[PDB]
Design an enzyme around this catalytic site. Structure first.
Site, mmCIF file in Angstrom:
data_model
loop_
_atom_site.group_PDB
_atom_site.id
_atom_site.type_symbol
_atom_site.label_atom_id
_atom_site.label_comp_id
_atom_site.label_asym_id
_atom_site.label_seq_id
_atom_site.Cartn_x
_atom_site.Cartn_y
_atom_site.Cartn_z
ATOM 1 N N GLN A 31 0.814 -1.353 -0.091
ATOM 2 C CA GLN A 31 0.000 0.031 -0.054
ATOM 3 C C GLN A 31 0.917 1.365 -0.143
ATOM 4 N N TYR A 81 13.762 -21.095 45.271
ATOM 5 C CA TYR A 81 13.182 -22.304 45.001
ATOM 6 C C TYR A 81 13.594 -22.891 43.553
ATOM 7 N N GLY A 125 2.026 -27.174 50.957
ATOM 8 C CA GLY A 125 1.455 -27.804 49.865
ATOM 9 C C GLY A 125 2.219 -28.203 48.870
ATOM 10 N N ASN A 162 2.141 -25.676 41.905
ATOM 11 C CA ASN A 162 3.326 -25.762 42.877
ATOM 12 C C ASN A 162 4.762 -25.769 42.438
HETATM 13 C C1 F43 Z 1 3.932 -16.285 55.263
HETATM 14 C C2 F43 Z 1 4.220 -17.551 54.732
HETATM 15 C C3 F43 Z 1 2.924 -18.565 54.316
HETATM 16 C C4 F43 Z 1 2.511 -18.095 52.730
HETATM 17 O O1 F43 Z 1 1.677 -18.318 52.267
HETATM 18 N N1 F43 Z 1 3.924 -17.783 52.334
HETATM 19 C C5 F43 Z 1 5.028 -17.407 53.171
HETATM 20 C C6 F43 Z 1 5.657 -16.208 52.818
HETATM 21 C C7 F43 Z 1 5.856 -16.025 51.355
HETATM 22 C C8 F43 Z 1 6.720 -14.906 50.897
HETATM 23 C C9 F43 Z 1 7.675 -14.341 51.768
HETATM 24 C C10 F43 Z 1 8.099 -12.703 51.638
HETATM 25 C C11 F43 Z 1 8.129 -11.921 52.776
HETATM 26 O O2 F43 Z 1 8.621 -12.589 53.758
HETATM 27 O O3 F43 Z 1 7.746 -10.950 53.004
HETATM 28 C C12 F43 Z 1 7.111 -15.237 49.525
HETATM 29 C C13 F43 Z 1 8.544 -14.488 48.891
HETATM 30 C C14 F43 Z 1 6.024 -15.011 48.388
HETATM 31 C C15 F43 Z 1 5.725 -13.660 48.055
HETATM 32 N N2 F43 Z 1 4.634 -13.121 48.670
HETATM 33 O O4 F43 Z 1 6.402 -13.110 47.307
HETATM 34 C C16 F43 Z 1 7.596 -16.665 49.906
HETATM 35 N N3 F43 Z 1 7.054 -17.136 50.916
HETATM 36 NI NI1 F43 Z 1 7.566 -18.980 51.765
HETATM 37 N N4 F43 Z 1 9.299 -18.822 50.700
HETATM 38 C C17 F43 Z 1 10.381 -19.845 50.726
HETATM 39 C C18 F43 Z 1 10.370 -20.867 51.545
HETATM 40 C C19 F43 Z 1 9.647 -21.186 52.524
HETATM 41 C C20 F43 Z 1 9.926 -22.264 53.794
HETATM 42 C C21 F43 Z 1 10.966 -21.495 54.396
HETATM 43 C C22 F43 Z 1 11.527 -22.787 55.745
HETATM 44 C C23 F43 Z 1 12.934 -22.059 56.437
HETATM 45 O O5 F43 Z 1 13.200 -22.795 57.264
HETATM 46 O O6 F43 Z 1 13.290 -20.712 56.156
HETATM 47 C C24 F43 Z 1 8.677 -22.146 54.628
HETATM 48 C C25 F43 Z 1 7.769 -23.519 54.153
HETATM 49 C C26 F43 Z 1 8.468 -24.577 55.030
HETATM 50 O O7 F43 Z 1 8.638 -24.506 55.985
HETATM 51 O O8 F43 Z 1 8.749 -25.672 54.240
HETATM 52 C C27 F43 Z 1 7.885 -20.744 54.044
HETATM 53 C C28 F43 Z 1 6.907 -20.184 54.654
HETATM 54 C C29 F43 Z 1 5.908 -19.171 54.264
HETATM 55 N N5 F43 Z 1 6.206 -18.668 53.284
HETATM 56 C C30 F43 Z 1 5.142 -18.798 55.470
HETATM 57 C C31 F43 Z 1 5.934 -17.533 56.446
HETATM 58 C C32 F43 Z 1 7.123 -18.569 56.920
HETATM 59 C C33 F43 Z 1 7.827 -17.612 58.420
HETATM 60 O O9 F43 Z 1 6.932 -17.172 58.921
HETATM 61 O O10 F43 Z 1 8.960 -17.431 58.238
HETATM 62 N N6 F43 Z 1 8.497 -20.424 52.773
HETATM 63 C C34 F43 Z 1 11.438 -21.654 51.306
HETATM 64 O O11 F43 Z 1 11.630 -23.194 51.546
HETATM 65 C C35 F43 Z 1 12.584 -21.516 50.289
HETATM 66 C C36 F43 Z 1 12.199 -20.323 49.223
HETATM 67 C C37 F43 Z 1 11.474 -19.470 49.615
HETATM 68 C C38 F43 Z 1 10.840 -18.500 48.840
HETATM 69 C C39 F43 Z 1 11.600 -17.303 48.030
HETATM 70 C C40 F43 Z 1 12.486 -17.802 47.224
HETATM 71 O O12 F43 Z 1 12.215 -18.729 46.501
HETATM 72 O O13 F43 Z 1 13.947 -16.969 47.003
HETATM 73 C C41 F43 Z 1 9.657 -18.002 49.816
HETATM 74 C C42 F43 Z 1 8.415 -17.495 48.932
HETATM 75 C C1 F43 Z 2 -3.588 -6.658 1.043
HETATM 76 C C2 F43 Z 2 -4.749 -5.883 1.632
HETATM 77 C C3 F43 Z 2 -5.736 -6.904 1.812
HETATM 78 C C4 F43 Z 2 -5.668 -7.182 3.315
HETATM 79 O O1 F43 Z 2 -6.247 -8.360 3.844
HETATM 80 N N1 F43 Z 2 -5.177 -6.367 3.955
HETATM 81 C C5 F43 Z 2 -4.700 -5.015 2.947
HETATM 82 C C6 F43 Z 2 -3.101 -4.779 3.088
HETATM 83 C C7 F43 Z 2 -2.883 -4.371 4.912
HETATM 84 C C8 F43 Z 2 -1.344 -4.335 5.223
HETATM 85 C C9 F43 Z 2 -0.445 -3.258 4.151
HETATM 86 C C10 F43 Z 2 0.906 -3.239 4.600
HETATM 87 C C11 F43 Z 2 1.735 -3.461 3.447
HETATM 88 O O2 F43 Z 2 1.381 -2.494 2.385
HETATM 89 O O3 F43 Z 2 2.692 -4.313 3.194
HETATM 90 C C12 F43 Z 2 -1.847 -3.402 6.630
HETATM 91 C C13 F43 Z 2 -0.550 -2.439 7.234
HETATM 92 C C14 F43 Z 2 -1.830 -4.677 7.826
HETATM 93 C C15 F43 Z 2 -0.330 -5.294 7.948
HETATM 94 N N2 F43 Z 2 -0.254 -6.505 7.537
HETATM 95 O O4 F43 Z 2 0.162 -4.870 8.814
HETATM 96 C C16 F43 Z 2 -2.983 -2.922 6.378
HETATM 97 N N3 F43 Z 2 -3.714 -3.715 5.350
HETATM 98 NI NI1 F43 Z 2 -5.154 -2.109 4.443
HETATM 99 N N4 F43 Z 2 -4.772 -0.564 5.541
HETATM 100 C C17 F43 Z 2 -5.583 0.522 5.431
HETATM 101 C C18 F43 Z 2 -6.411 1.012 4.463
HETATM 102 C C19 F43 Z 2 -6.781 0.269 3.245
HETATM 103 C C20 F43 Z 2 -7.634 0.553 2.476
HETATM 104 C C21 F43 Z 2 -6.775 1.570 1.523
HETATM 105 C C22 F43 Z 2 -7.791 2.589 0.618
HETATM 106 C C23 F43 Z 2 -6.865 3.521 -0.236
HETATM 107 O O5 F43 Z 2 -7.405 4.207 -1.168
HETATM 108 O O6 F43 Z 2 -5.562 3.598 0.028
HETATM 109 C C24 F43 Z 2 -7.917 -0.672 1.628
HETATM 110 C C25 F43 Z 2 -9.532 -1.056 1.802
HETATM 111 C C26 F43 Z 2 -10.296 -0.157 1.239
HETATM 112 O O7 F43 Z 2 -10.411 -0.046 -0.048
HETATM 113 O O8 F43 Z 2 -11.481 0.490 1.827
HETATM 114 C C27 F43 Z 2 -6.964 -1.607 2.127
HETATM 115 C C28 F43 Z 2 -6.901 -2.680 1.313
HETATM 116 C C29 F43 Z 2 -5.837 -3.873 1.763
HETATM 117 N N5 F43 Z 2 -5.420 -4.075 2.964
HETATM 118 C C30 F43 Z 2 -5.505 -4.688 0.457
HETATM 119 C C31 F43 Z 2 -4.220 -3.915 -0.230
HETATM 120 C C32 F43 Z 2 -4.685 -2.809 -0.903
HETATM 121 C C33 F43 Z 2 -4.035 -2.564 -2.083
HETATM 122 O O9 F43 Z 2 -3.685 -3.453 -2.826
HETATM 123 O O10 F43 Z 2 -3.511 -1.539 -2.179
HETATM 124 N N6 F43 Z 2 -6.317 -0.915 3.271
HETATM 125 C C34 F43 Z 2 -7.160 2.138 4.903
HETATM 126 O O11 F43 Z 2 -8.105 2.518 4.490
HETATM 127 C C35 F43 Z 2 -6.461 3.179 5.971
HETATM 128 C C36 F43 Z 2 -5.616 2.570 6.933
HETATM 129 C C37 F43 Z 2 -4.737 1.501 6.384
HETATM 130 C C38 F43 Z 2 -3.918 0.507 7.266
HETATM 131 C C39 F43 Z 2 -2.446 1.032 7.943
HETATM 132 C C40 F43 Z 2 -3.000 2.079 8.778
HETATM 133 O O12 F43 Z 2 -3.960 2.252 9.414
HETATM 134 O O13 F43 Z 2 -1.632 2.962 9.097
HETATM 135 C C41 F43 Z 2 -3.755 -0.632 6.457
HETATM 136 C C42 F43 Z 2 -3.604 -1.931 7.053
#
Ligand code: F43
Ligand code: F43
Ligand SMILES: C[C@@H](OP(=O)(O)O)[C@H](NC(=O)CCCCCCS)C(=O)O
Ligand SMILES: C[C@@H](OP(=O)(O)O)[C@H](NC(=O)CCCCCCS)C(=O)O
Ligand SMILES: O=S(=O)(O)CCS
Ligand code: NA
Ligand SMILES: [Zn+2]
EC number: 2.8.4.1
Lengths: 247, 548, 442, 442
Positions: free
Chosen positions: B146, B332, B444, B480
């Site tokens: 076009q 993790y 879990g 998980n």
């Molecule tokens: C609040 C929850 C319950 C829940 O829904 N998720 C938490 C918290 C969440 C937050 C902690 C961020 C923060 O401190 O603000 C994040 C990072 C998820 C988030 N919202 O971005 C996380 N756990 Ni948890 N959580 C993790 C872990 C764990 C391990 C930690 C055990 C230990 O002895 O330190 C235990 C589960 C278990 O006992 O197996 C755990 C518990 C928990 N997990 C207990 C808080 C425990 C505490 O009071 O200290 N996480 C891990 O086992 C390793 C990876 C680690 C995650 C971050 C990372 O992957 O870098 C993190 C992943």
């Molecule tokens: C190949 C097609 C059929 C189809 O599936 N899509 C096309 C082509 C496609 C391509 C054209 C890009 C390129 O040139 O490589 C794109 C940009 C979509 C894309 N792939 O990114 C587009 N049309 Ni079309 N297309 C448009 C238009 C139109 C108008 C152009 C009429 C004129 O007199 O110039 C007519 C439809 C009509 O008659 O109403 C039209 C047709 C067509 N449209 C005829 C090619 C017509 C030709 O041979 O010149 N577009 C428009 O009417 C305005 C906006 C305009 C779009 C780009 C933008 O919005 O900036 C573009 C939007």
């Protein structure tokens, strides 16, 4: 119930933690007030907040399941559901993440337990959470050097220990006193400073940690050497594989 | 001698890798880090400039109570802070995704049949060359028919072009070599023989649209942009009416009938068009990576280059941004391509398989899975136990689970020469790991790993699929971290061991054997390192049309 | 009893079959043959056993140019087709005496499968047909050759392709006339997403049968979409009757009168005469040497104009024996008739609009393709509510071989299998018969 | 029957209803009550007439916070609901004596609509229900108040929202339990995309009825998906029977035995004992102080384990009267029972896997939400083939009010309308009675 396979001390400890008829060894005494302080959900003396009315003051639907299942006291009262969360060092902490969750759902009613690598959590009704937390803090579930109560910033389970043998804590919630050999909790589990610290006792020594631990390690008891435990896990893999193909 | 990760651990910490104790809290927090210091200073400037608080080290908890580690990018001698491997901060990582997103493969076979059968005109290596000169003017956004057309600035779109390839050497020889991906030049002899046999007398275009367009728009733009300029160039070169009935045949061929997208579209909950990361199957990702054609004597290197490619794309960009966002999932992913850790584990497994079976010589069954996956899993986990520095390095369970299972799965596939038994090994590794350390990954992490064993060999509708065909949209895998990139590696593993030229699609393999790409797909981890050092020059920058 | 209208029904040779049929006897909601055709299309699947075998032998599964080296399986699937199909039927059927059909074609290379209607009575949609068929054949093949647990996933890939990684059954060796529900442009569109080439393939290029099947599907969709509810129901029913059912032999007679030497323009002249003759339109006003026509029944005028539209397509594209001009006929028939009468064209301008875009997207660079790849669910050709696509089917049936993307190229599997079903191949015969059956039930 | 199994059927009070019923009498493919429930859910729509009126009076149409100033229409829709509903029904019905239902609720503020089944007999899917209902009420409202041509498009916006600019009925004042076909995670998933809160709302928080409706929907979907075909059919039927229908009173008795003081662990112990008592499992091998169990019937073991899973949920979440822990129960019931027995857990690990992700996505920042917003079509909870979501429905039914996104907040319109339908509200009753009825035709 038999709970877990294996012939190691680790395997037996895992069974013991799960078994409700096994009396967990109490290692320390903690007051009611101090458990509430560590939890940080409410002040001592503050009334339990509620999330809904008492069950007695509601019209529950006609439901045989509701009739047969006794609600825990906190459910009756309409307590919030709150939490306590622990991190256990991979250097021979007595309890470990999956052992905790498995044990919790064997021992406790109405429990929501979650396992992760760096933390483990239980959520239940607040007043029942306090009774459970006492047992979790007083018994062999907890060691004040290799275990931590952490509601956030839990990093440490996989880290090297410090000079004192304490696990890393970004917020240093539990402080070892070199002069006394005792650990105090100076912040609650979310990391806010306590009015007065809570004594958590002495760290268990190396020998006792080895006796009580539930993690397999090459420098303790290796999992690959507990061949009966390994066998069952491989059996599960194979039976799951076959079952997915045909039943 | 040493394990391959020893140098990295030595560079991170003052202690020897074996030492169990260290010192915390006295490192100065964020002040220990050059990068965090740069961030703090930047945050102050940004906040002042815009009048809104931004980055502030005093918000929330204080980073850097432990050592903030450098990471070695595996197979390199480049050590960087982890922030330099965040995809937002790494132009190489962004360009890798852009180079995939902006690529489509479009056949000329249907098009040439329309010219000869419908139009009654001749196609020759001469008409094809003319067409190619035309389309390389047109494709970046310039006009051919076009009057009074306005066009894209050639310098802004310098990275856009069209090349062809064919299995027929004589025909390829007749086309101007500037437009040809030379299969015999880019691939080793046996691989070239296989790829040419797959392609045959077919002629295929590799179209790359401008990075600046891909960034302004999306992946689904690529095949449409491609088709428009192929259409114009067919009109111009072959003297159609500029818009007759036959023109529609060329459109349908280029958009539908003979197009190969990099990614297929996604379901509504994660709605995305074509050429987004979630639609890229693991087999394609393995073939996009070009390690296979340069490192063919080292199957571990090939497989782990694919893991690096996928870990970054699938975890950092896809799951860590497209599907979530924020700080995201850098580490993790870095677990799979830093410190030579996965390399050590996987070279161990390769040697184990090599000594016991020979590569691709093990029975393809569960006996082999139980043997290899168990052995490699135990090795990997023992390294974390023997080296406290390694455990502190890969501190998250998810990160250790992925790395150990990746080695176990790749090694099983090295043995069987089959990706499906490799996948079974990955899942077994997870089960053993969980029982050994009484933990695995995050809350879990093992949704797919618990479904895993039963779904490896399932044949049911949304369960059954060869691993090569699976991807981020396979239902179990859709959510998980710490799996997807590793699966891509397992997909590559048996084919690397077999010496296969490709994993799933030979056209995709050839399509990225192209020296005119911006990102170097023959050395993915090398490129990540270059990006980390702020030495990678991406396409798509607007510097030419903005003030000095 | 809802409408008073009655039509005379003819066959595709132009002979009167049944006089004075109530309009509603042709309704999709009432006519048992339309019900049977729709339920048949929901439940029918083509299986390419030869394709499955070749895919397995070569490990070429999961989409274009895709191959997994080392995964090849050599199985004698076509050679054991009888046993495999029988095993598959046992899983597909609900009971031994239901309407499950599994028939081998092409010496066992192909299979016609019709999944029992019982499965659809307790289904939300139609995907049970491909999914039940796919898994039955996957399991039947695995069981036939005792394919190992380790290799069976290849059989799954050979049958259903890259699903579920792909949303579609990408690379599958089964086919249906319907597409997956995710690809609907809107709710209620499923019967519109049937390629024109598939319809022409199923009816074996019989122009009037192709027009009929297309109209039945399009107008039935109009009911599911809610478009033929309330105010618009009669218009849609009259459109079905006159445009697709050759009611009153209007289409047939317009073609007979203009087939030898006629043009779109001469068809228009005859249709306007016929409408005036039948009292459908009358002169409303005289301008300067120009009569402005009016009507007291726009739905009937639309019906007559629609019949003329179909006849004009058959005359214009029939003369060329080339389908491409159907986009032009659809446009200018309607453009010309409006300036000839002063009355609105078919579907109140919507056929003309559809034709404008259809012309553009079959003669340009931007998308579309040949007439045969369009359908009522295509973004280009969805806009007219049942009045445009039937003409495209007629045009493609008349094409003598000018198209690159012909039914032979796009719909070979559909042709071999779906043309075996009598009510798909000759829908007009059955819908007319059924309408006569329920004649005094309306 | 294909299978030899028989079950004893019980009601929701744990009383024996019918002895020795063939398993397939409970099959979705055979049971007339399940067919009635599925066809009922397909054809039933809730209309919020109050919401339509408020939308028109304020011109707040087309989505959250949206409003067009100057377009307000003051129409007394609720005051004229009887006339509008009667007019709408006339358009919705096919014939006068058919099964169309339009019933006003809340003094005319709401309407229960059941679109005649004849419309679905000739439809590909289910969208005819909202689309036919919407247009009938739009036309009825326009006709009622003689709304002008210029303003009528506001009525359309008030009823169906921003469709078709949005793919969904964004801002619509009608609701169904099903969602639009485009939102299916895969073909055959339609009956899975029903929010858990919707099920709990329809069954009025009756735990066993909620579990039953959920299982019926999930397992019926498994048939449409092709999962319950051939080798896997029996496993799915046994799962439906024992987990969802309280077959042999197993779920009920486990809850009774563990309701007062029990835990997930004590339920497991009781289930394993019962499986051993009934010969479902037997000691295969003795390790050191550990018995390895095996079974000749994995499908039955899976069914027993699934019954225990449901009971464990009812005991654990019932004790807390708080739903959130159901993700934990689903995980650790299965994790524990595998190491207790040496046998695979429910759905061969797929429930445990679903539970892992479900826990994560109900306790993290990344997505999901509370238990009530999940469903079988949700990416997090689609993985188990029918065995996980029914427990989530039970848990939400037992929740005493700990959830922000409760049925009261997400499903109010669904509750008011869909709970009116007896078979939706008490599916266990009707499905059991139907199974007893067809007892000797199986
Ligand atoms: C609040 C929850 C319950 C829940 O829904 N998720 C938490 C918290 C969440 C937050 C902690 C961020 C923060 O401190 O603000 C994040 C990072 C998820 C988030 N919202 O971005 C996380 N756990 Ni948890 N959580 C993790 C872990 C764990 C391990 C930690 C055990 C230990 O002895 O330190 C235990 C589960 C278990 O006992 O197996 C755990 C518990 C928990 N997990 C207990 C808080 C425990 C505490 O009071 O200290 N996480 C891990 O086992 C390793 C990876 C680690 C995650 C971050 C990372 O992957 O870098 C993190 C992943
Ligand atoms: C190949 C097609 C059929 C189809 O599936 N899509 C096309 C082509 C496609 C391509 C054209 C890009 C390129 O040139 O490589 C794109 C940009 C979509 C894309 N792939 O990114 C587009 N049309 Ni079309 N297309 C448009 C238009 C139109 C108008 C152009 C009429 C004129 O007199 O110039 C007519 C439809 C009509 O008659 O109403 C039209 C047709 C067509 N449209 C005829 C090619 C017509 C030709 O041979 O010149 N577009 C428009 O009417 C305005 C906006 C305009 C779009 C780009 C933008 O919005 O900036 C573009 C939007
Ligand atoms: C019709 C359709 O194309 P297909 O027939 O599906 O190839 C569609 N294109 C467009 O609508 C392109 C529109 C902009 C170019 C023409 C402007 S007038 C699309 O790509 O989805
Ligand atoms: C579950 C789903 O979220 P919703 O429940 O739909 O909000 C989904 N998110 C994700 O899967 C996020 C995954 C990446 C972050 C977690 C990594 S482990 C999505 O946004 O479509
Ligand atoms: O703690 S959670 O497992 O929920 C999230 C890990 S990043
Ligand atoms: Na005390
Ligand atoms: Zn972009």
């Amino acid at each position: 119930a038999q709970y877990y396979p294996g012939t190691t001390k680790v395997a037996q400890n895992r069974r013991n933690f799960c078994n409700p008829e096994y009396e967990l060894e109490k290692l320390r005494e903690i007051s009611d007030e101090d458990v509430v302080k560590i939890l940080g959900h409410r002040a001592p003396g503050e009334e339990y907040p509620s999330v809904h009315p008492p069950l007695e003051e509601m019209d529950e639907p006609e439901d045989a399941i509701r009739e047969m299942v006794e609600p825990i006291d906190g459910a009756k009262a309409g307590d919030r559901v709150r939490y306590i969360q622990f991190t256990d060092s991979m250097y021979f902490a007595p309890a470990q993440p999956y052992v905790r969750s498995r044990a919790y759902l064997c021992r406790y009613r109405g429990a929501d337990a979650g396992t992760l690598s760096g933390r483990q959590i239980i959520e239940t009704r607040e007043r029942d959470l306090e009774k459970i937390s006492k047992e979790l803090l007083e018994t062999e579930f907890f060691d004040p050097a290799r275990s931590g109560v952490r509601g956030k910033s839990v990093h440490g389970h996989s880290l090297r220990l410090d000079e004192d043998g304490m696990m890393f804590d970004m917020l240093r919630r539990q402080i070892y006193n070199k002069d006394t050999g005792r650990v105090e909790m100076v912040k609650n589990q979310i990391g806010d400073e306590l009015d007065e610290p809570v004594d958590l006792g002495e760290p268990l020594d190396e020998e006792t940690l080895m006796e009580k631990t539930t993690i397999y390690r090459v420098d303790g008891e290796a999992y690959r050497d507990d061949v009966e435990a390994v066998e069952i896990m491989q059996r599960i893999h194979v039976l799951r594989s076959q079952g997915g193909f045909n039943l | 001698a040493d394990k391959l990760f020893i140098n990295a651990l030595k560079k991170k910490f003052e202690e020897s890798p074996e030492e169990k104790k260290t010192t915390f809290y006295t490192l100065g927090g964020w002040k220990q880090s050059e990068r965090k210091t740069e961030f703090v200073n930047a945050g102050k400037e940004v906040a002042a400039k815009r009048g809104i608080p931004q980055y502030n080290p005093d918000i929330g908890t204080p980073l850097g109570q432990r050592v903030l580690m450098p990471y070695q990018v595996s197979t390199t001698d480049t050590y960087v802070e982890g922030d330099d491997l965040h995809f937002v901060n790494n132009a190489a990582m962004q360009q890798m995704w852009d180079d995939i997103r902006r690529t489509v493969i479009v056949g000329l076979n249907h098009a040439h049949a329309v010219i000869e059968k419908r139009l009654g005109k001749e196609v020759t290596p001469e008409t094809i060359t003319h067409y190619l000169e035309t389309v390389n003017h047109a494709m970046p956004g310039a006009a051919v028919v076009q009057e009074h057309m306005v066009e894209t600035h050639p310098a802004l779109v310098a990275d856009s072009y069209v090349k062809v390839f064919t299995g027929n050497d004589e025909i390829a020889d007749e086309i101007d070599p500037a437009f040809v991906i030379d299969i015999n030049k880019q691939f080793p002899e046996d691989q070239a023989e296989t790829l040419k046999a797959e392609v045959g007398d077919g002629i295929w275009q590799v179209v790359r649209i401008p990075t600046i367009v891909s960034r302004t728009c999306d992946g689904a733009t690529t095949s449409r942009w491609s088709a428009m300029q192929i259409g114009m160039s067919m009109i111009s070169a072959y003297k159609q009416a500029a818009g007759e009935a036959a023109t529609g045949d060329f459109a349908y061929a280029a958009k539908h009938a003979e197009v190969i997208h990099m990614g297929t579209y996604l379901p509504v909950r994660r709605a995305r068009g074509e050429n987004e990361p979630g639609g890229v199957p693991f087999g394609y990702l393995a073939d996009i990576c070009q390690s296979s054609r340069v490192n063919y004597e080292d199957p571990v290197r090939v497989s782990l280059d694919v893991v690096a490619t996928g870990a970054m794309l699938y975890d950092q960009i896809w799951l860590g941004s497209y599907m979530s966002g924020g700080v995201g999932f850098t580490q993790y992913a870095t677990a799979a391509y830093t410190d030579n850790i996965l390399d050590d584990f996987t070279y161990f497994g390769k040697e184990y398989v090599e000594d016991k079976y020979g590569l691709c010589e093990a029975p393809n069954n569960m006996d082999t899975v139980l043997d290899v996956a168990t052995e490699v899993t135990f090795y990997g986990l023992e390294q974390y136990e023997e080296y406290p520095a390694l455990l502190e390095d890969q501190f998250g369970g998810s990160q250790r689970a992925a790395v150990v299972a990746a080695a176990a799965g790749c090694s099983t596939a090295f043995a069987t020469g089959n990706a499906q038994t490799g996948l079974s090994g990955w899942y077994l590794s997870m089960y053993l790991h969980k029982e050994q350390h009484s933990r695995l990954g995050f809350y879990g992490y093992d949704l797919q790993d618990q479904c895993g064993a039963s779904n490896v060999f399932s044949i049911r509708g949304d369960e059954g699929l060869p691993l090569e065909l699976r991807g981020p949209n396979y239902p179990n895998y859709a959510m998980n971290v710490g799996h997807q990139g590793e699966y891509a590696g397992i997909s590559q593993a048996p084919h690397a061991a077999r010496g296969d030229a490709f994993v799933f699609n030979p056209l995709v393999k050839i399509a990225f054997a192209d020296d005119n790409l911006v990102f170097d797909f023959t050395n993915v981890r090398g490129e990540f390192a270059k990006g980390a050092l702020r030495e990678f020059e991406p396409a798509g920058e607007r510097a030419l049309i903005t003030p000095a | 009893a809802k409408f008073e209208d009655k039509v005379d029904l003819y066959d595709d040779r132009g002979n009167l079959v049944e006089e004075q049929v109530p309009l509603e006897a042709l309704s999709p909601l009432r006519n048992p043959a339309i019900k049977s055709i729709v339920q048949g299309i929901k439940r029918t699947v083509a299986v390419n056993l030869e394709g499955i075998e070749n895919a397995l032998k070569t490990a070429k599964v999961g989409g274009p140019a895709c191959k997994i080296m080392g995964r090849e399986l050599d199985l004698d699937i076509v050679g054991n087709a009888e046993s495999i199909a029988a095993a598959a039927k046992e899983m597909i059927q609900v009971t031994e005496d239901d309407d499950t059909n599994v028939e081998l074609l092409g010496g066992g290379k192909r299979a016609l499968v019709q999944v029992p209607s019982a499965r659809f009575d307790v289904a939300a949609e139609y995907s049970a047909a491909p999914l039940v068929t796919a898994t039955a054949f996957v399991q039947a093949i695995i069981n036939e050759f005792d394919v190992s647990m380790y290799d069976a996933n290849m059989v799954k890939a050979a049958v259903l392709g890259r699903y579920p990684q792909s949303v579609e059954y990408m690379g599958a060796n089964i086919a249906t006339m319907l597409d997956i529900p995710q690809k609907l442009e809107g709710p209620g569109y499923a019967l519109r997403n049937i390629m024109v080439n598939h319809v022409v393939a199923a009816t074996l290029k019989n122009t009037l049968q192709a027009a009929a099947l297309s109209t039945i599907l399009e107008q039935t969709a109009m009911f599911e979409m809610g478009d033929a509810v309330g105010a618009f129901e009669r218009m849609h029913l009259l459109g079905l009757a006159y445009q697709g059912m050759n009611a009153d032999n209007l289409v047939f007679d317009l073609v007979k009168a203009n087939g030898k030497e006629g043009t779109v323009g001469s068809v228009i002249a005859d249709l306007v005469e016929r409408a005036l003759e039948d009292g459908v339109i009358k002169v409303e006003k005289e301008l300067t040497d120009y009569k402005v026509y009016g009507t007291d029944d726009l739905a009937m005028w639309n019906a007559y104009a629609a019949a003329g539209l179909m006849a004009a397509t058959m005359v214009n594209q029939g003369a060329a024996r080339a389908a491409q001009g159907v986009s032009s006929t659809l446009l200018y028939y309607n453009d010309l008739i409006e300036f000839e009468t002063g009355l609105p064209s078919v579907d109140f301008g919507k056929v003309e609009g559809t034709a404008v875009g259809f012309s553009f997207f079959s003669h340009s660079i931007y998308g579309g393709g040949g007439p045969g790849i369009f359908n009522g669910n295509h973004i280009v050709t969805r806009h007219s509510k049942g009045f445009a696509i039937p003409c495209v089917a007629a045009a493609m049936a008349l094409d003598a071989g000018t198209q690159m993307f012909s039914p032979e190229a796009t719909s070979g599997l559909i042709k071999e299998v779906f043309s075996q079903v009598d009510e798909f191949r000759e829908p007009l015969k059955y819908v007319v018969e059924a309408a006569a059956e329920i004649k005094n039930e309306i």
